[PDB]
From a paper:
To circumvent the high cost associated with antibody therapeutics, we engineered alternative toxin-neutralizers templated on the designed ankyrin repeat protein ([name]). The two monomeric [name] constituents of SD5 exhibit complementary functions—SHT targets the enzymatic A subunit of [name] and inhibits the toxin’s catalytic activity, while [name] #3 binds the B subunit, based on the cryo-EM study, and induces a novel conformational change in the B subunit that distorts its five-fold symmetry and presumably interferes with toxin attachment to target cells. Finally, the unprecedented toxin conformational change induced by [name] #3 represents a novel mode of action for neutralizing Stx2 toxicity and reveals new targets for future drug development. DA1-SD5, composed of SD5 fused to an albumin-binding [name], efficiently protects mice against [name] intoxication when premixed with the toxin.
Shiga toxins belong to the AB5 family of protein toxins and are comprised of an enzymatically active A subunit and a non-toxic pentameric B subunit. Interaction between the B subunit and the carbohydrate moiety of the glycosphingolipid Gb3 on the extracellular leaflet of cell plasma membranes enables these toxins to enter host cells through receptor-mediated endocytosis and to be retrogradely transported from the Golgi apparatus to the endoplasmic reticulum (ER). The pathology of STEC infection is primarily caused by the action of two exotoxins—Shiga toxin 1 (Stx1) and Shiga toxin 2 (Stx2)—which attack the ribosomes and trigger apoptosis upon their uptake by the host cells.
Numbering used by the authors:
A (entry chain G): 1 to 185
B (entry chain A): 1 to 242, 259 to 297
C (entry chain B), D (entry chain F), E (entry chain C), F (entry chain E), G (entry chain D): 1 to 70
The structure:
């Protein structure tokens, strides 16, 4: 399994095709459950994702954490690979063990293009993490002003309170992101 | 071997130290300029010692000339002192392996450590003053000393003498600072916290400097050297690390062109996530 | 899979409290907080790190990494 | 934005448990406790850090910082 | 029992948040969070550790380890 | 106010959960655990710390301290 | 009482999560979580630590320790 997941991570499309043609399993997990689709998705290798998916690799397949290829794509900012996963039936609102949606992850890492594509595919804008953290809280935290402005524009709840009562405005002040605080006024 | 450390003038004093260094150590290839280097003590069997006759406390006079320090050569510790008038070697309890032929050996109950000496002396090295006058007083205390147990004044004398002999031999910094007290103005040398720290880090410094290959700096615990002149201006002689090792087996790690004692970096890189640390009470 | 193996080229604490490292030319991030000091220590001391993960595309998450002094 | 890039000139733990660093002549503070020892290790070792924030005015906050070696 | 005594040959942060070290040719994992940086620092300095566990085969877990000055 | 400036002479964790450092001949304590590793690291690396407080009385608590390499 | 003052001869993370150091030939354990990295840093750098406790027999616990620079 290791060779097909190494090839996938390296984006080596002809090595993926040769291993597949020698009967390597398309769904082959590492330790921690990472499948070749997970590795391809995190590296943004579009061509590898399309050849894996057209060999019958499981689009929703979950790590031990409950991270799916659409989560790994989102974490990595890989817009085109997010779009092809969604167009092959990957669940937009898949939540990991700790309730994190792909919209939470995108928000967390500042990736405005995939925040916009996820929202347009029906991502739950106000989705609550286990400690009641919304995407707006993760994006006010980490100081991603552009994300915070794309949220708010799409009807994100500014009033929403985490498990400690703390708003998005609170968590910007506690991160000393004064421009985020201004934008949240 | 016997050497003299002559306190008559700064010249005689530095000359004396340099002569000792040249005989008992060899310069590091990479930390040597002219004949001023960081040198590694040449290997000698444990128990090997050299005697240091203290001279010149009264400038250029053959007075106050009955004190000899016995220095274990491999580590430069002062194993004890000899009253040459009474032919008596007062040896610290941790140096029973040092035998001086021809003298009466008085094995003391007191060990040689600074922890002990400072306690018995009721004198901390940090801030300790040494002047020509206090070395004479120190000499007189040692010559008056008799007994198998150090007294406060004898301990104070040894603290002062170890500093200006063994520690100055190790550290050109101490040689430089202390030697001012030998000038005609007779100022007072005050041992600084930095001087104390050097003495406390000698083994660590010794383990690291041999690895130096011109890095932009050297960091050993609290000690920092930013260039070779800082190294040379500070350290003269190091242990032969071939108390060099505290734990582990990796002398150094080069980080951002600075040679770090690996233990030091390990000691601030062994923290877990701060949030978890503080909340996990 | 072994996503990347090499020295950490840079690391970065992110606003979402995850931590990114660039290894062998690829960036990966982890949300595991205890990996922050572990990775920064590896970076400072020049350890070779092997980022391991189900998927290995640049910008992907990881929570398994091996550390070698060499 | 990249607010400041350079070595940490001083760091400072504040009474409100935030932590300030001065980089390239500008001071920035962070309320992310995790960054405290990471910034101190970077300061100790002369890492070049890049303070990143949407607001770069000296005295403002940050929660994103890149750590580079020489 | 004292399963392995020697330097850490490699360490590894695992997906399940446990941490593995290879000592005397055998891998051992621990779920003690506090041991992660302590083992990594031991590793970086070549500190000898003694892994103590009920079973000593490679793959065994441990919750006790001695950091030696050997 | 700058209460003391200098290297840390000793540090001490007390049974009452306070952490004392002696700087420039004066002792101050803090119960911020965040400061323990920071202060001890400053101590073992010889950083110059500046203890700051509105309260500069000996034996008083502090929670503001600047760290400088020197 | 000052039970022991000396360098840490070994440290050990115990199965009950307490942490033991051997100082002056006697073993002392502490359940104070904050002390683990500090004690290991002292061990790594050869700091003289002073174990203070109400009982000094080997096997006693402690919650107070001084970290000196000798
Ligand atoms: Na000479
Ligand atoms: Na010589
Ligand atoms: Na070492
Ligand atoms: Na991944
Ligand atoms: Na800012």
């Amino acid at each position: 399994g290791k060779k097909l997941l190494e090839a996938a991570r390296a984006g080596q499309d002809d090595e993926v095709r040769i291993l597949m043609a020698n009967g390597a399993d398309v769904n082959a997990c590492d330790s921690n459950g990472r499948t070749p689709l997970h590795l391809a998705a995190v590296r943004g290798h579009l061509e590898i994702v399309e050849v894996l998916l057209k060999n019958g690799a499981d689009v929703n397949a979950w790590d031990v954490i409950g991270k799916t290829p659409l989560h790994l794509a989102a974490d990595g900012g890989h817009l085109e690979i997010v779009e092809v996963l969604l167009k092959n039936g990957a669940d937009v609102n898949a939540w990991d063990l700790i309730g994190r949606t792909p919209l939470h992850l995108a928000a967390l890492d500042g990736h405005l293009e995939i925040v916009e594509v996820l929202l347009e595919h029906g991502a739950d804008v106000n989705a609550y993490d286990r400690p009641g953290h919304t995407p707006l809280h993760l994006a006010a935290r980490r100081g991603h002003l552009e994300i915070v402005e794309v949220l708010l524009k799409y009807g994100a709840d500014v009033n929403a309170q985490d498990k400690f009562g703390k708003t998005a405005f609170d968590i910007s002040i506690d991160n000393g992101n004064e421009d985020l605080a201004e934008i949240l006024q | 071997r016997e050497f003299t450390i002559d306190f008559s003038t700064q010249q005689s004093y530095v000359s004396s130290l340099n002569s000792i260094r040249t005989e008992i150590s060899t310069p590091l290839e990479h930390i040597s300029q002219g004949t001023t280097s960081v040198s590694v003590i040449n290997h000698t069997p444990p128990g090997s010692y050299f005697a240091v006759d203290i001279r010149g406390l009264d400038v250029y006079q053959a007075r106050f000339d009955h004190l000899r320090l016995i220095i274990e050569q491999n580590n430069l510790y002062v194993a004890g002192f000899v009253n040459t008038a009474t032919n008596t070697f007062y040896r610290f309890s941790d140096f029973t392996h040092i035998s001086v032929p021809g003298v009466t050996t008085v094995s003391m109950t007191t060990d040689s450590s600074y922890t002990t000496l400072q306690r018995v002396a009721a004198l901390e090295r940090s801030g300790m003053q040494i002047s020509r006058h206090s070395l004479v007083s120190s000499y007189l205390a040692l010559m008056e000393f008799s007994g198998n147990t150090m007294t406060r004044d004898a301990s104070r004398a040894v603290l002062r003498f170890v500093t200006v002999t063994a520690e100055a031999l190790r550290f050109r910094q101490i040689q430089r600072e202390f030697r001012q007290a030998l000038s005609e103005t007779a100022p007072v040398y005050t041992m600084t916290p930095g001087d104390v720290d050097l003495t406390l880090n000698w083994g660590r410094i010794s383990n690291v400097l041999p690895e130096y290959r011109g890095e932009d700096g050297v960091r050993v615990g609290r000690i920092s050297f930013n260039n070779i002149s800082a190294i040379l201006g500070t350290v003269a002689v190091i242990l032969n690390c071939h108390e060099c090792q505290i734990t582990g087996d990796r002398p150094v790690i080069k980080i951002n062109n600075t040679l770090w004692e690996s233990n030091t970096a390990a000691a601030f890189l062994n923290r877990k996530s701060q949030f978890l640390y503080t909340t996990g009470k | 899979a072994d996503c990347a193996k090499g020295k950490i080229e840079f690391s970065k604490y992110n606003e979402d409290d995850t931590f990114t490292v660039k290894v062998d030319g690829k960036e990966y991030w982890t949300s595991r907080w205890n990996l922050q000091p572990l990775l920064q220590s590896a970076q400072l001391t020049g350890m070779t790190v092997t980022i391991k993960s189900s998927t290995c595309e640049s910008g992907s998450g990881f929570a398994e990494v091996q550390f070698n002094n060499d």
